[PDB]
Amino acid sequence: EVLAAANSFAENYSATSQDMDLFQTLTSCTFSKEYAWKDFLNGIHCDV
């Protein structure tokens, strides 16, 4: 039922500027100094 409700809500969801801002808030940087592990691992290379 939760999955069905999620599908029903997402199929009829309209993007909003405030919702975009809050999603970016989630995506944006943090109040604590965090190391960017994603681009570090993406750009890393190991040699034997």
Binding site: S14, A15, S17, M20
Partner: protein, 48 residues
């Protein structure tokens, strides 16, 4: 104008519809001043 009384309603519909499709708002002068109005129906009336 042709139907002057509906101009304010048309403005509000422009404000909300473009906001619905794309996050940018036209109340900001930079977008509405030139960038958005490019999507208008021209009156050149080419004949082929």
């Amino acid at each position: 104008a042709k139907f002057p009384d509906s101009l304010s309603v048309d403005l509000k519909t422009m404000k909300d519809g473009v906001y619905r499709e794309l996050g940018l708002d036209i109340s900001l002068p930079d977008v509405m001043k030139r960038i958005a109005p490019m999507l208008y129906k021209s009156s050149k009336s080419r004949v082929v």
